[PDB]
Design a protein around this ligand. Sequence first.
Ligand SMILES: Nc1ncnc2c1ncn2[C@@H]1O[C@H](COP(=O)(O)OC(=O)[C@@H](N)Cc2c[nH]c3ccccc23)[C@@H](O)[C@H]1O
Lengths: 362, 440
Amino acid sequence: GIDYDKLIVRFGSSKIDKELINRIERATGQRPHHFLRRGIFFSHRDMNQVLDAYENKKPFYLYTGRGPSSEAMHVGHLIPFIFTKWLQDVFNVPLVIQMTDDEKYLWKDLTLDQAYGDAVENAKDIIACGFDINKTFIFSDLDYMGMSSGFYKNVVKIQKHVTFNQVKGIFGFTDSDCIGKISFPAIQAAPSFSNSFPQIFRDRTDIQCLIPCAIDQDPYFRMTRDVAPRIGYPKPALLHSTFFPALQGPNSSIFLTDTAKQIKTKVNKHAFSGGRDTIEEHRQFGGNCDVDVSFMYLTFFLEDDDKLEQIRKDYTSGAMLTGELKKALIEVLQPLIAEHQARRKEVTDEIVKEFMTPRKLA
Amino acid sequence: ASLLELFNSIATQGELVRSLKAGNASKDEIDSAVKMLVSLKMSYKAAAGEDYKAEDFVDPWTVQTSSAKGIDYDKLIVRFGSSKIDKELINRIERATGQRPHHFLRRGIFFSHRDMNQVLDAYENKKPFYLYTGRGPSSEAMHVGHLIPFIFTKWLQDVFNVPLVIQMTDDEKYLWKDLTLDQAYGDAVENAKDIIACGFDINKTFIFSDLDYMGMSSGFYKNVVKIQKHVTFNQVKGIFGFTDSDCIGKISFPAIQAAPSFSNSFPQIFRDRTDIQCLIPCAIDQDPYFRMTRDVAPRIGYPKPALLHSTFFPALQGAQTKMSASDPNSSIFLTDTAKQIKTKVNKHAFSGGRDTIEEHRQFGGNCDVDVSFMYLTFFLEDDDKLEQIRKDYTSGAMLTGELKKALIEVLQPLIAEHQARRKEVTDEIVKEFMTPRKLA
Ligand SMILES: Nc1ncnc2c1ncn2[C@@H]1O[C@H](COP(=O)(O)OC(=O)[C@@H](N)Cc2c[nH]c3ccccc23)[C@@H](O)[C@H]1O
């Protein structure tokens, strides 16, 4: 499939090797998450710096976000949230999650209230991922900007040190775009600096930030990292993941709303197959796990490394047929999604409100 | 002697350093100018005993014309597409306030407007309206020219008895100049004292700094974002002359100056109401921001702000440019002493009189290019006396020195009284003016 080792060279990032993974295990005392064991999160920037601080009792915080969608969230979207939740638990650090409602308002046909409405709704799905309410701040840009003595100030600092020419290349803007889009990159970068959240870190500016993201986003975070020293702040560290495969690449992906029945259908009739044409060729040459979306999905959601390896072998040999594989996946997805919907149902307005209230995170 | 020559050079270099600090010069440029000032003063301390004792272009940053008579304001009205203030509008304001039209209105200083009749309609129908004006902070760089908008705004507040919001654009200063946020905010708080000293009613006036208020308002940023969606980069390149090499902060700044035009940007003052009419007093060089704001308003469901535009108080050197702290010897500062005011008028105010007293007696003076006379039209409140001075100077009966002496007698008390009032502005009063809260 995709040659991720080349993307590392292309972007200039660092490969997450076994020694780093072992160091993470020693620092936390926890077994490394399966995304690390399987190369899902394979690249980074300054992770050793983060561990240097952590090992010396100098904590950091996590930062991630989400563009509020009209309840159009699929299993692929779970990846960074699942990893961020794991990072939060094993390092036991605070986390800030930005809901870019102002971004959606600027890019989509929505009123400011509708954009905000989508953000609060999406927040429920994020809360359903299990983040600890005592250490997690989920904020709406539209709301938080007007109730922070540090966020806007950081936005302006960034705005002063980034030119249109710079963002034009990185984000592909043209002078036909509204000024709101042009300066937005500063708002997405501001959360990377601790003094943007006074209610959490007060006036401290030395608390390193760690951002889990997709490798193809490295160019975007490069802007934030380059501006950091220019404004006297530490650069945020990054952890890069691979690309979540499209079902093939309403039926282009499996949504967190889909029912058990819908999940079955999606996998059996739409999930791309890496097996052979006829059962004759398959029992001989076997199936290819590098392109079979059904198996790739398993590498992300099946936690048992042993069962996953067994399924791989039998699918590559021919002993196991595509239909058998797709059923193994369905047995993994149905409960995964069912449990998410169940937890989402428990998210009360009182809960979402608390998560969204700027407050100290003991 | 040569010792005098040294003294003058230090004064000149000092005036230069002051203008640089007031303009957009970088810290390095300023530092280099200072090193010379310092070096030039060290040489004086030696060669002496003591140390040393002391076509028309109009946009938000520049006012330029080659005409000694200044900007052609009627033409500017056509170019900007605004409306001339006629006798009937003035008479209507008089009937609505029961007050004599301010002399700025009577003499065509505030000569242009946008929707003033909409404002009067609302007022006469018992509907509320609020005033909004602003200032780009700069440590004691405020000159007499700055009094035009502020004196008039205070007059409007008095005769209409309406609330007022004054924006101190410290973020604008931070984006365009070389300074820290604390410095920028500091200048906002200082200039605020100059403003308050104009006499604004503390029960109806809210003065806010962008840097500080943006982070404590449930409505300001939301309006900024709404505005930002309806203005393209191309549009601001055409209106303000921005380029692709400008920082993104400068490019979106226009939305910040537009936001105060909408009442719900101030929830602590007007709650959630979005129908409060807004009137914006300013010199016409600020119109670009609001012509843009007016086109955006209906797209986001708000009323268009009305405007009242004033002409420019000219630079001492002549009406070719406006008075500006950025230009050497161009301004008469609110911090100047009586002696300084006197010296600036006599030594720098461009004269429309003849070269010789003989020629002056024979041909008289030209009030259309004489800076001292122009200044009188702004501050000499007595119309008949203004007219008498005009006739006498024009006939040659009055000499330039007499004309300048009359102006000096007007400017000294004007500024001295301001300083007297600024001296009474305590840190508690400034903090109260800048505290968001309901306005009586
Ligand atoms: N020579 C002159 N003669 C007469 N009036 C003059 C002269 N020079 C300046 N002005 C007027 O003074 C006010 C403040 O000037 P600023 O350049 O600080 O102004 C600025 O830098 C703006 N970004 C601040 C601002 C924000 N919101 C506003 C709303 C209305 C007016 C101004 C603002 C203005 O009314 C300006 O027109």
